[PDB]
Paper text:
The ribonuclease in these processes is the RNA exosome complex, which degrades transcripts in a 3′–5′ direction and in a processive manner. The helicase can extract mRNA from the ribosome and is expected to transfer it to the exoribonuclease core through a bridging factor, HBS1L3 (also known as SKI7), but the mechanisms of this molecular handover remain unclear. We show that rather than a sequential handover, a direct physical coupling mechanism takes place, which culminates in the formation of a cytoplasmic exosome–ribosome supercomplex. Exosome and ribosome thus work together as a single structural and functional unit in co-translational mRNA decay, coordinating their activities in a transient supercomplex.
For structural characterization, we incubated the 80S-bound CrPV-IRES RNA with ATP and with EXO10-SKI containing an active SKI2 and an inactive DIS3L (D486N mutant), with the rationale of extracting the RNA substrate from the 80S but preventing degradation when the substrate 3′ end would reach the exosome exoribonuclease site. Signal subtraction of the 80S combined with focused three-dimensional (3D) classification, subsequent refinement and post-processing resulted in a reconstruction with nominal resolution ranging from 3.3 Å at the core to 8.7 Å in the outer regions. Human EXO9 has the typical barrel-like structure, with a lower ring of six RNase PH-like proteins (RRP41, RRP42, RRP43, RRP45, RRP46 and MTR3) and an upper ring of three S1–KH (‘cap’) proteins (RRP4, RRP40 and CSL4)10,11. A notable difference from nuclear EXO9-containing complexes is that a long segment of the RRP45CTD (residues 281–351) becomes structured as it wraps around roughly half of the EXO9 outer circumference. The DIS3L subunit contains an endonuclease-like PIN domain and an RNase II-like exoribonuclease domain that interact with the lower ring of EXO9. Second, DIS3L contains a C-terminal domain that binds to EXO9 by inserting between the RNase PH domain and the RRP45CTD. The outer surface of EXO10 presented additional densities, which we could attribute to three separate patches of SKI7EXO. In the first patch, SKI7 binds with a short helix (amino acids 555–572) in a cleft at the RRP43–MTR3 interface, consistent with mutagenesis data, and is further encased by the RRP45CTD. The third binding patch is located at the EXO9 upper ring, where SKI7 (residues 602–616) binds at the cap protein CSL4. From here, SKI7 residues 617–632 protrude into solvent with a highly conserved α-helix that extends towards the SKI2 catalytic core, engaging it in direct interactions at the RecA1 domain.
Residue numbers in the entry:
A (entry chain G): 3 to 72, 90 to 270
B (entry chain E): 555 to 572, 579 to 593, 600 to 632
C (entry chain N): 9 to 273
D (entry chain K): 1 to 353
E (entry chain J): 5 to 188
F (entry chain A): 381 to 434
G (entry chain F): 5 to 290
H (entry chain I): 1 to 212, 217 to 293
The structure:
Amino acid sequence: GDHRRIRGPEESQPPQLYAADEEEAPGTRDPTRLRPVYARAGLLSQAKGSAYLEAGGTKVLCAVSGPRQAAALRGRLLCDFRRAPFAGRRRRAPPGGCEERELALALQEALEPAVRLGRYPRAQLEVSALLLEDGGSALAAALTAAALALADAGVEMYDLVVGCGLSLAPGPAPTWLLDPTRLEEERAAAGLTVALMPVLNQVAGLLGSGEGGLTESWAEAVRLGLEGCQRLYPVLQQSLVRAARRRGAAA
Amino acid sequence: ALAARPSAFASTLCLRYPRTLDLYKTFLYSRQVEISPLVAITPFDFKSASPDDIVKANQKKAFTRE
Amino acid sequence: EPLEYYRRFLKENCRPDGRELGEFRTTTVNIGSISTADGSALVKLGNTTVICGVKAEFAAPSTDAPDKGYVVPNVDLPPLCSSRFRSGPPGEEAQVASQFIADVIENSQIIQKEDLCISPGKLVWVLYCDLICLDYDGNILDACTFALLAALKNVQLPEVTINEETALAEVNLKKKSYLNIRTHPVATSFAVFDDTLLIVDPTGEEEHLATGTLTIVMDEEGKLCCLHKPGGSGLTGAKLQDCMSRAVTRHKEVKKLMDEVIKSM
Amino acid sequence: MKETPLSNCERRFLLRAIEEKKRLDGRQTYDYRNIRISFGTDYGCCIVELGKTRVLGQVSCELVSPKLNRATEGILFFNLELSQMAAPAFEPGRQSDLLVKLNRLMERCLRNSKCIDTESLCVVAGEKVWQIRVDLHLLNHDGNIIDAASIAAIVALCHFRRPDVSVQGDEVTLYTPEERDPVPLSIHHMPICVSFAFFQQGTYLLVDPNEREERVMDGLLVIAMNKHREICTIQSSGGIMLLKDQVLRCSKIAGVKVAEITELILKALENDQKVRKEGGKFGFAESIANQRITAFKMEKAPIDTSDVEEKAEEIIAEAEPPSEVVSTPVLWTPGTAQIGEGVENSWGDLEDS
Amino acid sequence: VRYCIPGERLCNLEEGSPGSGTYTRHGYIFSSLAGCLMKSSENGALPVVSVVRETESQLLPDVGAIVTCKVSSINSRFAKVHILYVGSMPLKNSFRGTIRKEDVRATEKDKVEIYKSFRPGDIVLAKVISLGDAQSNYLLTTAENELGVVVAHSESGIQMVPISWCEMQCPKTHTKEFRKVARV
Amino acid sequence: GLLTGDVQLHPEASCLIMTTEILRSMLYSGSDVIRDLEWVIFDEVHYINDVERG
Amino acid sequence: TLSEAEKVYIVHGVQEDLRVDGRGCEDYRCVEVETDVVSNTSGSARVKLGHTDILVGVKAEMGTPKLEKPNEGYLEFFVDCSASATPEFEGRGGDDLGTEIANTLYRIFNNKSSVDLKTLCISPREHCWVLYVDVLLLECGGNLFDAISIAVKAALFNTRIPRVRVLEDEEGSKDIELSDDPYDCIRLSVENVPCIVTLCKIGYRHVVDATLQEEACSLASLLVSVTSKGVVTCMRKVGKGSLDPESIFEMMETGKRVGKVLHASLQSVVHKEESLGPKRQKVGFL
Amino acid sequence: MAMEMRLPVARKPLSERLGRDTKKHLVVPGDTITTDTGFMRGHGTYMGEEKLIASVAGSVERVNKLICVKALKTRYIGEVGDIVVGRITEVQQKRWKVETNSRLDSVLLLSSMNLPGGELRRRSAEDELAMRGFLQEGDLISAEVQAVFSDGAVSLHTRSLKYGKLGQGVLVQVSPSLVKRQKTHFHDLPCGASVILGNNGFIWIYPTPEHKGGFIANLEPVSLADREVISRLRNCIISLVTQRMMLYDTSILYCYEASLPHQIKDILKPEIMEEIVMETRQRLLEQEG
Amino acid sequence: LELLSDQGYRVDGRRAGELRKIQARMGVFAQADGSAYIEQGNTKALAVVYGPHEIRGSRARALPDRALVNCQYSSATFSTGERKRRPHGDRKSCEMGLQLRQTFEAAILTQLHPRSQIDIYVQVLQADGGTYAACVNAATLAVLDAGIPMRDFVCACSAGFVDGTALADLSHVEEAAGGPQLALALLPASGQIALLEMDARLHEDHLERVLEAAAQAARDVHTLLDRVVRQHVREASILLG
């Protein structure tokens, strides 16, 4: 198979497809709540900038490398999304996946409207994000963490990027929910993730697909996503303050 | 919008790694292991000609070209 | 400047880390945090953080001996742990860091593949243990080994029973068994300076300036599994006998650590 | 790195020669550089030397399940390879427009001629059948890689000997050279490649050219044709523009040459079988010229293994025992424990808040 | 003292002026870094407010800047270098440069043989002049009395010493060699 | 520089001394030398009356 | 690329409801859609929106149902990017664009009510129909998303799916037996297949069907997926600049109206092409 | 708004709509051209064995010893004193690189450029730092070819007052064989706009410069009555260029007047071009004839 | 299965020395610098060329004496009965683009464009029979459409051998029968051969007749494509003036 890795069995069917325990029932909740979030910046020592974001069942680690050699008059912004194989219900092929490339492009087309590349001619910035565990909305964590890492790496930006996520209930009276989990995401019909700049009040990225076809529900999904991105800001406000207070006092 | 308290995995991931007598004995350094220079003037204090400056002031002052 | 500056601390007998040239960094581990994997463990060694995860699946036994369940290790070095690794196919350092772990798993005989078969010739367990380095500061092959051994002490598998007329597999997810572990191989790494100086627990800068490296892994009965010497200056029997005397204490330290963390449940 | 360039004096001299119908190494137009074969010890392994080129051939078989459809035959891999040591230019992934034409020539010749009998390589159908796998390597490049590669593949396939099995009822069994004697293969014919080079727009031709003569030529014509009088592939290539009498002349020439080469190959295989059957000594070792300055041989030697016990004993006895400062493990909360110099506080809390 | 995030309201255009690493919009002054709040009062009131981290891990070169370098190889008409320090501070990575045979001396003169000016392995102080092409990227210059090789190295691994404006001599074997000595 | 017909020396020098026909030769084409010209002086103007070269 | 003065002229023109071609802020250039162009496949289309050129093909083949649901089929997309479109598309280089389009099409069609899934299953847990949609980029002249989302609805409307009456009984001939009729097929009920609507933003005005020059002067854009009934399937924002909340709401209405007109006029044109059958011949590439 | 979606219509071959027979000599590659005692080969042909063999499709054109074949589709070939229009694609240390639909790139030397200031002050290496600042990547110029290099390359200069960096307007690229050779390629058409007929196939349309080199930016809004003229000329140029028409001052003026009766937005149909090109054809027939 | 009846008729109804019907076209695309379209029998080909331009990448890979011919080959995933999708790494595409580069490095009179590239692209929309000759003829037409000078009008055709007779313009049914197939690339004026290929076994006595029949079938393709070129040039000459 692969001549650069250790070869095992050619085929391997996971026991979930043989799992005789029937799918359980998620439950119910209040759709006006947010999972408590703990954020830490400046984690890695060998990285120019890093941040670790954890909320409920989500664990994502992002690191930012400094400018390197090689629209110039402007610098590029390379991105790379990759999730740990021991994440989710099943295993994943190490070489890659189309979903990862889709999330990488959804990251690149969302973090460029924030940094000002007109200050790094002929240079480039590289951002790497890793998902240790998938326990809910993922693209709402690869944006917050990769934006905290950039601000902590001493690059000049217009503002931060704060993300959120939503999902649609499958009942006869569907209602959008805030911060869904895997028990509330695999039983859903549609999902939406927004990227709002809290001060400039400008939407950076939008993505959504599903079974909701009336152009009056998506207005609410968008504006409650904006309210979520306006409610996640203070925690990220005190995280970079603590990061700089600790980093500066070490000199 | 309440921020929360960490848990084991995070509080171990964020670790800062920063004479008191003698231990681990065999691993000390003592147990495991003329110059007449006649040096020249030590620096060259540039007290002298520095040609670029020469040719510039030379031609500017001279200003004859004949 | 490079060589002379460090030897000032060497003659001082206190390297810039603040160590007595014969002591290890601070070591800490956690087990049982990632709930989407069969077993996982996080190892911190004063930087050089490594995390491992185990997933169990079903697979067909091999054609030669249809009573063995495969175990496949893999070590990955992402471009975020350090700044010298570039994206793409795995590099030389990760390939050697994976072949070393495969050799340790094979030679040490920590597990027996005959304990993983369900029905001979039809189905066997397969274990996927993946290690990802979160930060590269030095001494990679010591923490990778400790991460793998710590992870293998927590993986638990469910009781699977195969019918006769249906001939399918019914997993009993309530009664979950454990894994049988025979030995506890622990590794120790030495960095040799220009021709005579040997230090323990090196650092990336020291490995950048050193001229060799040696690694020795020991069992719980004073038996050597592998003697990894990629090459360099050259050593003698007396120096190796000096190294194993330190490795005995290191192995006793680590085995007491594992014997204590597991007891706390 | 790249290969040395070609001057403008050698080109003139080679073309003056070719005009004059005299070659560098003395051999006239319709000649080959003489050949020299050498056999390994385990079956299906040979080293052919055409002039100063070397190719290593090695056959090997294995038992697999035969895909879906074609339930009563076997598969036949091939893999040419160019070794970085063959010549300066060869680079593992920077000569990707010669490998293709070479693999193709080799595969079309060997697999479309239907000389190997892949009919009788089954055990059951729908179940395990033998999967052979030829392998060639180029060791030293001196021109005409494909004639040598073809002769090498021929000899390697005509010297192999399979394992062998017992099948009766619905039950298998696999023997070994002591339980049962290895078995030969079935080879219908002997397809042998020939190459021609054309010089200054088809006015002259030269059989079997070497590497300088290969850099002063317009294009190449290959004609692969098994014994008797039966052509099996042709592939014009290079920079050539051909007539119609010339293809026929070339076909005649290739006929003659393949006749002679098959003579040689048969004689060499016969001699090798005679040697293996008499009971004498064979192998790569007993092929090294002894009449030559660059060869040396040494029979066995007990060195003196009389002292190792004493030295090891004194070494173990003469060194410092493990010390006795034992460390303590600290318990924070079930799940995480620390060993080493430790940390002052139990854990951080409200450090900055 | 207070720190910053790369956006917040700081001052009006009348209550101060933007400084280094800041931007303004709609009559307000907005932060663009996470450093420290510094207000340079200077003289004349209306302080030029700016934010500086003051812990520079990396910094991009400019049109004019002093850099400490390290020669990699030399040619008859150029000399590739590696940027190592941006003025004083250490650099986490290494860029590339090129000194053409016009930037050695402060006259842009003829002659000026490159071979005996910048022997490889030395450390030099130079100034950039441009952002360069894709072949030569930074186009450094040493056309000054203060620029040139500062700390050389002997043939056999001995710290070297300046001896003149053009000549340096070994202390051990008393050997004479040619460099381009910069003023200390 | 001397741009005489039979002697050509330093055609890129700061000061060029040439016959008259050379000036018209470099004036028919661009030659990118007129851009950096500050003074052009004629030494024998009495050839306006010349019957074949005026 | 185009200079700064040209970009200034274009952005000024768009704000004045004038464009270099002469149309308005909402006009839409005509297309030359056609069907039944390729022989070996089971449905074809050819959409020409301008300098762009599209050619697709749908082939229905026998297959096995997936594990999650047994009474269903599935759809397979493969957006090839031929190298004849642009010299820079030589060999490798058209892979990222092709993957981006294929993933967008998957998100468009990843719903329970896209067309149907009961019709493509014949025997539960044992067999199902599979559809291979194969887009082939021939030329690129801007607005590539809509020129493909139209040729997909067009080609999907022209499928055959030859009927099979084979009995599944073990005693009977379980092996799939066709109807043996070379001209016996079944339609596909594609009435509510969605389509993409692109809205480039220049200045503070949004423009439908932007050209390459008008695309190079824009900073962002929005994609809306609307069926004939007027419902939204996918909504993805693509670009390099912010957009602002208001422009989402005022772009959604234009996406709705353009979608409704596009679907009604496409239903009319396909019915006009179908009203007369084997007459009128078929012309394409010659 | 109705979103017309028409259907393809079969093309009528042989150009039967007017009907003409050619009296020229037509050849295809491989054909043997006249093989008399002594002749000289042109561009488009080659020689074999005592034979003049055509190497490209076209018509033979001979001026009194010379057999050559003129192809009907080529790329631009440079000649001395030829007006061209190009775009900067690379900015080098001592030159720019300009793309002008040729077999290679064209070089604009720094020595030949009206630098800012437009008079005699100085020219030295201090300008070299800022030379790469104003003539940046992707700008438009309009220069004149200076000389022919030894590998088909062309060097172009900007040593005049009408040449230099261009401003606002629209660009239309066509094949470099529909432009008629003349002596004045600069025009000031009495419609409300101007035009530059680049000999390489680049047509540049810009408004008249009000009263009276890139020194002036003039990045201010252009009046509404000027855009409609530019759009009309853009569509008329596309219409004449499409079928056969060779472009020059009178054909564009004739077609512009013929396009007044109906709107600028509605002229994109296959038939409206025909009914305009034929009317211009007959106006040329009743004027020249 | 009968591949040649006693009466002499093939499976599809044509005799031994009879070709299929060809229907070509010049000037299909507008953005590119050349185009063509040919359907030889039931095989639909397509070719697009780009004129001499600046070398992409500019990695000092130029030739100071001539131009750089670069030919590709591709195939649609619906070109045959089964889907048979392939990645862009197959060695069939590489060998077809190498025989295409070999024949067009010999047909084109390339010593007139130093330090220049010529990019040739071929797309097969439906493959049934000889693909090589359909690609060669479509790219010969595209090169003529682009105005690139060349020595002659290269045309290609195949042949075969069944029951002691020589066939011409074999089809997929006849090709997939294990016979001595054979293809050329001929220059009609000189009779020279630009490429020769073969597979499967064949006696030495019958090579002259298969080769002669293939050359004659290529000369028969020449006239049919020549009338298309002459009608196109007379069309444009009438249009121009």
